[PDB]
From TrEMBL, chains A, C, D, E:
Functional note: Catalyzes the removal of terminal sialic acid residues from viral and cellular glycoconjugates. Cleaves off the terminal sialic acids on the glycosylated HA during virus budding to facilitate virus release. Additionally helps virus spread through the circulation by further removing sialic acids from the cell surface. These cleavages prevent self-aggregation and ensure the efficient spread of the progeny virus from cell to cell. Otherwise, infection would be limited to one round of replication.
Annotated positions binding Ca(2+): 212, 216, 242, 262
Active site: 69 (proton donor/acceptor), 320 (nucleophile)
GO biological process: carbohydrate metabolic process; viral budding from plasma membrane
Domain of life: Viruses
Residues included from the entire protein: 83 to 469 of 469
Subunit architecture: Homotetramer.
Protein name: Neuraminidase
Entry comment on modification after translation: N-glycosylated.
Length: 387, 119, 387, 387, 387
């Protein structure tokens, strides 16, 4: 039955580890897809790990030059959580170099973006059947969340961006129902920049935490209801969430231009005026990951926080991070619980290999005892194909 | 044709052991039964044991059970016979002799399986 | 429940990409069948990719000399769409070096042709149970669609050809019900040649678009109803659909002899007097692929067309193409939607390898925004086994 | 619901090919079990391929010396038909170096024999739950059909042999119900020898065709009813069915001593006084396979037959063969249809390798057009592990 | 429906072999997890093999130094019995270097322990959803059964240990209901030491047989009811069950200090004052395994026993062993039948390799004929990665 989604976020006091696939380590021997931009999304019965393959396997010559994010060979596929993304256990979803997926409660909705940079087309599938398409309106690379979309009452929502990555672009909110786009609104957000949003439903509405790749070291956000009336803003906290960023300092409810140039996909969970912030430990590279609870970070500009939980050691590689929720329909609770995943990027550009891939770890929020630690990728690079 | 080349002569004190080699300088070796027969001077032929290298099975006469060991080397096409606890009555000429026909196909291999058409 | 099939073809205005398996690329490392002649067919619940294996894996010595289309080792197998045809995810269907398969709505029907060239026998299976056989009646290699058959009201139809590939042969229509051949008619089509037909149901009837390997650069077609009363003819369009062919010129409603010698398996969708034509971009070799909408091409002989959508670049390898439909029982629509797949042949005879195999792409027709692009195989040849 | 089994054998006039797994060919690259003694058995829903693994994979050093039929590492496992026996698609049944399995209509019954040669114990499982055991009663290797057992009315029957393989042994019939041995009878058959029987139900009774390894070149048989009252005999036909055997000559209703020494597992289908005989083409080695219809071969001693259908060419390796039936519960017919499988042994002792394994082909009887051909293993030996 | 668990243990007179996966042997070629601490647990429908991976595959460089029991890469995963623990057939359960799992009758309960040594946290999952957590209360490595937990009437119980492995530690009993910890009691057991308990339900109560790593060569035990009222003690039999141990001598109902230093995970089944003891054959190393029936061993101190059944030869490697039961809901019997598994550790420290892994064998108790034999690992070490 449909996912109601009228519950508020469960309030959380930590993070318990949920899954770790150990892909790249197992990829040194097994047959493992070269992947990047993975994300988790759950149905009222199970959770799956979606990812963008490169049409090639690790330790294979076809994994050469797989830095390039866009090729006609990339495909969106999914496998059970904690499992390695192998051709023998992965289900095909769509041909895409930019993707998003969520479950309205009755069927998997997948959004796959492929085509040329000037004419990219997003293919929408509901139960694997093509239900709708949408073509780039700015003719500059069309891209989407790279994380799960948010479904409420039977309608699922997502964010897409068309235009420059280093300047003012065009951003849209969509309201899909059974794979058919029923409403869309372009956001009137001058001087804002939205990319790779992490959207989660919260008490019949949706709030997306996104990445400002143009002039922002804090994260922009947009919240909206089913009618797509929206409000925009930036996380005011002096605990900056993007990477790169400056050191913790006085924040701003607008874009912070210092180290405001290109960033990393991330997420945040808003609790009133507070915010759970997931970010890298390093300020320059994509190293380490941690969760920080700022009780006034959503509306306040100071750098004070009360809780910090280690996720990945500051010396070890991290990458994209995104939110995913577990609805009461799945958990039996009375509130929609938040969780998140972390991508562990290995190889190029930072390492001496011919390839780039990533593994994943995931955590779910609980109101009980937790602990901080380091759950890194763990692969020993370079691989045999790199010699 | 096939030629079986044995090791040179041997002299042993009692209680010691001896090992004689049998190099099949030909084709047959793998699927063929090899027997070891000894003959005391001026006496009759006495069969000690046999081996089928492809099946890894051996069959020993009841007189030599416990102190005879017949092994094979599929790589070098060589057979071996090792007799321990040597007594003066073991003084004899020791022959190794291949069988005449290829071993039959045995799906249920008995650990002591052996066949004999003629050496 | 049975597949009614009384709906007309949905009218289409483009093609959205449906799947891409990236077989040969993943075959460089993983365990992947050496395949050829793949095709997609759908049930009211799922879609599958059928293919004829060679009893061997890519990058293995047993893939030597696998040009020969007929051997006792070739088997018809199937795996989910967009998935790599591996022995670890492929279901066995039948021993065949020529096959066809379709779903009447309650069970998979598979047709496998094996045996000697003079005595070939087609084994018919319904739910994997042998239900009927049919033997070569002209003792010259017996062959069939190599694409999905067409089911209407519970009865499935196919085409088989017996006789010479470079001359006049014998062609028969069959009407299978639960795997049992219930009626057959030999077509009286002198000077016609039918091979590897692409049949789709259209409002209680079936129209097959086929390949004229004897003297034809346009495609022959045959349409029939449940009683197997049949029409024959050739696509009149001056936009020639076979490969090789001549340049676009004045067409003919009969076989066009110029470059009429051996061709390639193809398809077409008739809409009134118009036709959607899928064909290679090159005139001599099997390179590139494109979809062309000729609004009067089914009955008119001019070379004018109004719409063309790129599928595979003119420089990259293409191969067999075939139609497959998605019935309202599966999609929930009110008309049977058309789709198609493209085989991307790699290796011999055009490339310096010891093997020949193929990957697949597929597209489904939508009445919405689409884009043309190039989705090629992408494998870097030769492979390590070829040195 | 239970499998009634009161239908007579369907009368047949040929054999249509059912499956071919191409194991050893795919085993050169993929991860494939080193197997031997495979057999097919069907439920009222599906058919499966059971086999005895060697706890090792092809082209691996652990496949060394795998001639020896008995080791603590051999296990009975099963996979879908026509599929390769890989650890990624094989279901575990029991630890066994001699096995038998059949489906009473509600649950898989499996019989696994392991242990020492003097104390072998057959483990009986019903739905994977150990339901009974039986210990060797003559302390000389305990062995069973290596093909499917036969179920009637809810009771399944098998044959086991305890004692010498080159002389008089002890033979017992069992009547298992839901995995529990409820009745057993030792056969009073002096000068008879029974090994590796191929039993099939025939209209509420069972007739087993077996292998005389001691002094028999024709095949011994035993038929019995639910109360295990039995009749014994040998196939009288002068078309000898064992391998080795003499040339076709005057047969005998008793054991034929000429070339009566060790044989090969086989099968036969009795139709009144006629018999369908499956046997190798060669008289000395395990080469080729063919089906021969002798209309009076069950009770007559002449060498005349009326129908012969080629299965495997006389020059190519063959091996064990066994019967398996498809009940009306599965096929919807009004009679229990007969089928058979053929093991294609590759490697030792006949070939220059360090291993022995086998693939499988299978055929089902139909009353329609068929053809003879050669469907051999096809693997190019030696493999890379043998250098 | 819930697992009642009010039946007593079925009385047994032997052990019939249930499964053997041949992992390490197949790991030489196939893609197989480097595992350790495997155990079997059954639902009312199936049985599964849980295990702690090392995030690496056999014969891969990432299997180097995999002696260390604790790393951020170890994960609790499961696959069907007798199947090889491959990433292509294994289901993910939780991130853990110490685990326990059982089925209450409606959903799999899994307990995964990860984190630092001073702050380890056990993540509890019910149907893969995180339902509870519990943190280390003594800040010295938190560990659990490494075998199945025991469920009665819908409540599942387990044992956890916190503190020194070479001295007095803290031991707690838990009562989980639908993955939620509802009651816990710390055991008042001075001079006792509990580690890696093998718990089985027995007529509405639970009795765990454990490992005394501090000063015990006999096995400690603790039994409790649903209210967690408990009784403690040691197996009094002079047939010592731990490894290392002294020779069989006069036993004690307290800890036997002679060879009382570190031991091996084991199990035992109490029947009145009799006990079925599973132990290694060697007194010093982990070699061989056997089952011993001592009719008065539970309360008596003599070394006399009446039955002994060989499991693994004294010369071949053995390792962890644990109990697992099959409830009447699964077997249809009127009593809860006992079974057990044996881990076969290969590699370090005893062998010249860079890795440590294990395979498994399992036996189930039957009141029928059985036999003793040796079912060892069988892998030929070292592997190619060790050169
Ligand atoms: C597979 O198993 C067979 C056994 O069935 C192994 O054969 C053995 O091969 C070795 C050489 O590889 C033989 O050893 C030799 O011994 C002679 C002395 O007799 C010595 O002079 C040589 O230098 C060499 O060490 C051994 O006798 C032979 N054993 C048998 C029973 O034939 C084979 O090596 C195994 N191959 C693999 C790849 O595992
Ligand atoms: C794949 O199959 C082809 C056959 O289609 C194999 O080709 C054959 O290659 C061998 C050499 O590798 C050729 O043999 C040569 O014969 C000449 C005499 O004519 C002799 O002087 C040379 O020393 C050599 O022995 C053989 O003629 C050729 N056959 C054909 C029909 O082309 C090829 O070897 C196979 N490759 C693999 C990897 O399986
Ligand atoms: Ca930025
Ligand atoms: Ca603050
Ligand atoms: Ca042509
Ligand atoms: Ca036109
Ligand atoms: Ca015989
Ligand atoms: Ca006759
Ligand atoms: Ca101890
Ligand atoms: Ca005692």
């Amino acid at each position: 039955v449909k996912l109601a989604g009228n519950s508020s976020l469960c309030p959380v006091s930590g993070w318990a580890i949920y899954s770790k696939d150990n892909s790249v380590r197992i990829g040194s021997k097994g047959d493992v897809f070269v992947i990047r931009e993975p994300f988790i999304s759950c149905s009222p019965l199970e959770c799956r790990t979606f990812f963008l393959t490169q049409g090639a396997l690790l330790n294979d010559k076809h994994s050469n030059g797989t830095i390039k994010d866009r090729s006609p060979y990339r495909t969106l596929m999914s496998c059970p959580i904690g499992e390695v993304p192998s051709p023998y256990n992965s289900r095909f979803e769509s041909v895409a170099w930019s993707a998003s997926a969520c479950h309205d409660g009755i069927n998997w909705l997948t959004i796959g973006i492929s085509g040329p940079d000037s004419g990219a087309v997003a293919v929408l599938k509901y139960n694997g059947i093509i239900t709708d398409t949408i073509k780039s309106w700015r003719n500059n690379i069309l891209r989407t969340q790279e994380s799960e979309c948010a479904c409420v009452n039977g309608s699922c929502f997502t964010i897409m961006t068309d235009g420059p990555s280093d300047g003012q672009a065009s951003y849209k909110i969509f309201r899909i129902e059974k794979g058919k786009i029923v409403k869309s609104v372009e956001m009137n957000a001058p001087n804002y920049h939205y990319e790779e949003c992490s959207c989660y439903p919260d008490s019949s509405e949706i709030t997306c935490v996104c990445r400002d790749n143009w002039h922002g070291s804090n994260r922009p956000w947009v919240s909206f209801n089913q009618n797509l009336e929206y409000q925009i803003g930036y996380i005011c906290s002096g605990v900056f969430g993007d990477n790169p960023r400056p050191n913790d300092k006085t924040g701003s409810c607008g874009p912070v231009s210092s180290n405001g140039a290109n960033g990393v996909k991330g997420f945040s969970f808003k609790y009133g005026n507070g915010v759970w912030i997931g970010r890298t430990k390093s300020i320059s590279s994509r190293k380490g990951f941690e969760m920080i609870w700022d009780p006034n970070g959503w509306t306040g500009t100071d750098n004070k926080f009360s809780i910090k939980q280690d996720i990945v050691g500051i010396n070890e590689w991290s990458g994209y991070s995104g939110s995913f929720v577990q609805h009461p329909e799945l958990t039996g609770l009375d509130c929609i619980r938040p969780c998140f995943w972390v991508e562990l990027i290995r190889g190029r550009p930072e390492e001496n290999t011919i390839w780039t891939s990533g593994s994943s770890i995931s955590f779910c929020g609980v109101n009980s005892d937790t602990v901080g630690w380091s759950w890194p990728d763990g692969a020993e690079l370079p691989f045999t194909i790199d010699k | 044709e096939v030629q079986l080349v044995q090791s040179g002569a041997e002299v042993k004190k009692p209680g010691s052991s001896v090992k004689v080699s049998c190099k099949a300088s030909g084709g047959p070796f793998s699927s063929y039964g090899f027997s070891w027969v000894r003959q005391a001077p001026g006496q009759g032929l006495e069969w000690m044991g046999g081996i089928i290298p492809v099946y890894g099975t051996t069959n020993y006469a009841q007189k030599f059970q416990g102190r005879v060991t017949i092994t094979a080397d599929e790589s070098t096409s060589t057979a071996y016979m090792e007799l321990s606890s040597l007594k003066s009555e073991d003084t004899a000429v020791y022959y190794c002799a291949r069988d005449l026909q290829r071993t039959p196909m045995v799906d249920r291999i008995i650990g002591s399986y052996y066949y004999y058409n003629g050496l």
